[PDB]
Amino acid sequence: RGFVPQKEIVYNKLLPYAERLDAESDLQLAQIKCNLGRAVQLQELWPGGLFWTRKLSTYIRLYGRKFSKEDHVLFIKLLYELVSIPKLEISMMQGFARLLINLLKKKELLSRADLELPWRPLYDMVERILYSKTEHLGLNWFPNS
Ligand SMILES: O=P(O)(O)O[C@H]1[C@@H](OP(=O)(O)O)[C@@H](OP(=O)(O)O)[C@@H](OP(=O)(O)O)[C@@H](OP(=O)(O)O)[C@H]1OP(=O)(O)O
C-alpha cells in the first residue's frame, strides 16, 4: 500500500472482516496526523490535542504500531516536545507520557540512527516532580502515579 507498516497486530489479519480493516487503518491514521498537527499549530491543546492523542493511543491498541518509520519518529518527536514543555500541567503531561512510552516501548523498531532524543529536558521534569520544593508546602498538588 502507501506505507510499509511497522509492528501491525497479527490477530487483525485473522479476523473475518480483515479485508475492510486496511482501509479504516489508513483513514484513521490520516485524520490523526492532520488533526493532531493542526491542533498543536493552532495551540488548542485541551479541546483537540488531547482528543487526538487519545485517538492515536486507541489506534495502537486496535491496529498495533501500523505506521511508517518516518511517521513513528515524527509522532515520537512531537510527543517528546509536548512532554518537555516547561510549565505544562502535570496531569496533561501524564497523558502525553503514556502515549510516548507506548511508541518507544518496542526498541527493535527504531535503530538509534532513526531517533536521537535529548536528555536535559527530561532531567528538568524529574527535578520538578521527584524533588519539588513547592510540594512539601502543599503549593504543587501533583498526581499520585
Ligand atoms: O500475544 P499477546 O497475548 O497479544 O501479547 C502480546 C505479547 O505479550 P506476551 O507475548 O509477552 O504475552 C507481546 O510481547 P512479545 O511479543 O514481546 O513477547 C507484547 O508485549 P511487550 O510489549 O511486553 O512485548 C504485546 O503487548 P502490548 O499490547 O503492550 O504491545 C502483547 O500483549 P497484549 O496482550 O497487551 O497485546
Taking CA atoms, 101 is separated from 76, 91, 132, in Å, by 9, 16, 23
Q: Which three cell numbers stand for residue 59?
A: 489506534
The coordinates were experimentally obtained by: cryo-EM
Q: Which residues contact 124 (CB under 8 A, 6 or more apart)?
A: 84, 86
In angstroms, the first-to-last Cα distance of the chain is: 41
Q: Which residues of 4-24 are buried (b: 16+ CB within 10 A; e: fewer)?
A: eebebbeebeeeeeeeebbee
Give the Å distance between the CA of 39 and the centre of ligand 1.
Answer: 31
Residue 64 has what DSSP assignment?
E
**Header resolution in angstroms:** 3.1
Nearest to 57, CA basis, from 36, 27, 37: 36
Long-range (24+ apart) CB contacts under 8 A made by 49-52 are 49/82, 50/92, 50/95
Q: Which three cell numbers stand for residue 145?
A: 502515579
- CA–CA separation, 142 vs 145, rounded Å? 9
The percent helix, strand, coil of the chain (3-state, each to 5) is 65, 5, 30
Backbone angles phi, psi at 135, to 5 degrees: -60, -40
Give the Å distance between the CA of 9 and the centre of ligand 1.
Answer: 10
Give the Å distance between the CA of 67 and the centre of ligand 1.
Answer: 18
Q: Are 87 and 40 in contact (CB under 8 A)?
A: no
Give the Å distance between the CA of 81 and the centre of ligand 1.
Answer: 28
Give Dmax over CA atoms of the chain in angstroms. Answer: 58
Give the Å distance between the CA of 136 and the centre of ligand 1.
Answer: 39
